[PDB]
From a paper:
We recently discovered that FEM1B, a substrate receptor of Cullin 2-RING ligase (CRL2), recognizes C-degrons containing a C-terminal proline. By solving several cryo-EM structures of CRL2FEM1B bound to different C-degrons, we elucidate the dimeric assembly of the complex. Furthermore, we reveal distinct dimerization states of unmodified and neddylated CRL2FEM1B to uncover the NEDD8-mediated activation mechanism of CRL2FEM1B. Our research also indicates that, FEM1B utilizes a bipartite mechanism to recognize both the C-terminal proline and an upstream aromatic residue within the substrate.
The overall architecture of the FEM1B-CUX1 complex exhibits a high degree of structural similarity to that of the FEM1B-CCDC89 complex. The conformation of the CUX1 C-terminal fragment is slightly different from that of its counterpart in CCDC89. In contrast to the CCDC89 Pro-1 residue, the main chain carbonyl group of CUX1 Gln-1 is hydrogen bonded to the side chain of Ser122 in FEM1B. Trp-2 forms two hydrogen bonds with the side chain of FEM1B Arg126 via its main chain carbonyl group, with its side chain making π-π interactions with the aromatic ring of Tyr84; Leu-3 makes hydrophobic interactions with Tyr163 and Phe193; Asp-4 and Gly-5 make very few interactions with FEM1B residues except that the main chain carbonyl group of Asp-4 is hydrogen bonded to Arg126; and Gly-5 makes hydrophobic interactions with Trp-2 to stabilize the CUX1 conformation. Phe-22 is snugly accommodated into the pocket that was identified earlier as the binding site for CCDC89 His-21. Phe-22 forms hydrophobic interactions with FEM1B Val391 and His502, π-π interactions with Phe501 and Trp367, and a main chain hydrogen bond with Asp356.
Author numbering:
A (entry chain G): -23 to -14, -7 to -1
B (entry chain D): 1 to 627
The structure:
Amino acid sequence: KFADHLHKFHAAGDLWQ
Amino acid sequence: MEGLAGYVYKAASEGKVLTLAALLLNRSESDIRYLLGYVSQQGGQRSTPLIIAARNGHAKVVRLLLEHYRVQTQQTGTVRFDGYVIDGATALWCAAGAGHFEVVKLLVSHGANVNHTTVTNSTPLRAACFDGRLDIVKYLVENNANISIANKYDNTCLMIAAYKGHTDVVRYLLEQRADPNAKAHCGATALHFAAEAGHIDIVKELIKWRAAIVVNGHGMTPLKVAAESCKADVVELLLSHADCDRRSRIEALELLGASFANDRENYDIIKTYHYLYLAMLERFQDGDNILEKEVLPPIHAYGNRTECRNPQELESIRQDRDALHMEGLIVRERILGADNIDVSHPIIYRGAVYADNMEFEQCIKLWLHALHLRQKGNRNTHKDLLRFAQVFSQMIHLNETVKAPDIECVLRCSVLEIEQSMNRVKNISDADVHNAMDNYECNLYTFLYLVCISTKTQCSEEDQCKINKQIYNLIHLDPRTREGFTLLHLAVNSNTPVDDFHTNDVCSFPNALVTKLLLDCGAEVNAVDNEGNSALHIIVQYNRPISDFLTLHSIIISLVEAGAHTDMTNKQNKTPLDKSTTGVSEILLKTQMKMSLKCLAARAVRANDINYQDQIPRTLEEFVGFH
């Protein structure tokens, strides 16, 4: 499914630990 | 004791005590320090005993290491929690990140660097807040662990506590003189993170502490941030301040009533019309002061829907779930702006749903609009082109014929993105060259897939001229991968990774059509890669010249008729027929090549060296270098 591949876009170091 | 760090590291990995007690045996100062402080490599970490003694939560190992001798608590180290390999992580930092109160109590008691920074300036208190344990946070604060110290991007421990969902440490931090109104490099006030994550209680105690409301760097108020991520619970609280005015009330209501429809997780049509009606009713019943929305031109992507600015017009949409999605896209783009980072994702998700419903006609439109919005924001569109290639391959695979303007637009955006990726690669240092070059190679591969889709699509003469011009621009841009492969070397190489989603269905490198299109577009038929293999040295090394012969004969008869030199020499001094992995691929080459006394004399000059700088024509000075 195409919509399933969109879950991978939900990288930034601002909110990292 | 020279290098016996395996014993101590393995014992501390599971927190063994008796193994370490047997390891230490009556040592004077020199060998006892050489044992206790002996770090090792263990690639990826720093492999100190007192990094894995705290990461795995074993206070006994640290206890024996810190009772009768004081081992280096201030030990620089790198530890990983998923993809979080952060340097400067002492035992206190990694212990707080994992969330063990026992080992932390056995570190600060002797006195540890409670404010030990790193490359990201992540205080141990920030790691504890990321873990979320209340006991470690209050223990650190009570030991003066520098609450005010932020990261590189000004992401103070309160903000990461308000984002990862830990109300207890948030309440404690606000109760211990923290900064509710702390900002960031881009603007990430404490309400922004909690609103984005959607925690009701955290926003409750933040506004109870007067955290105030300030606009983000992307023109986002905390209420708009809350409405953007479809979190309707936090919006209702922030709407109760009665200081946002109706201009922000009807803005946030429309924003979330639009976000609900075109969202992945909490997609609800019932929770879309309700909020849209609550939004418009605020401005369509007041008296002789009614507010009408600002005009929006009819965007072609959203079915030429000019949105709805009437109670009767909106009531006409609570019968068509196909129209509420477009209305949500329109409202989100009207409020969030055409330059926001997160305005693109709902459009791509709606297009993906349309593609999954086999309605590719509107998927192409929506994704083209999303790609235009992303590319006019200087964003990284190295995956949107891949998704276009996948949609086009699925369209070609089933029975469907893709429109030629669609391929034209995607190819133009692809050459623009590849030029931009070349600019980023040329204008960056080795800190992020790896990822930038990986994205550059991905963009090149997506362009190749798009060209392969274009070859397998019949279109009129004007459309083919447009597509050929778009390819010709990138050909003249001269793109090259990390190993020197040009845009033609990959079209003949069988090792280029075709994406497995849907481009694996119909895209088969090497292609005769793709290489003919590239050679007819001015590709350097005689170019070389980093090693020296030309476009002919690579195709000749083909796996299947007995079944894929038609695209091995029509890629050799087309290369050598376009000017490719059949006698060229790479770095290892190997002619193309000397670099033949089969027989059917050297027989074709030997058929498609002619004896020229120029090549024979050039080989004789290159073998018995003549110092061919002068006493030779300028153009033959590279001809001799070819052989």
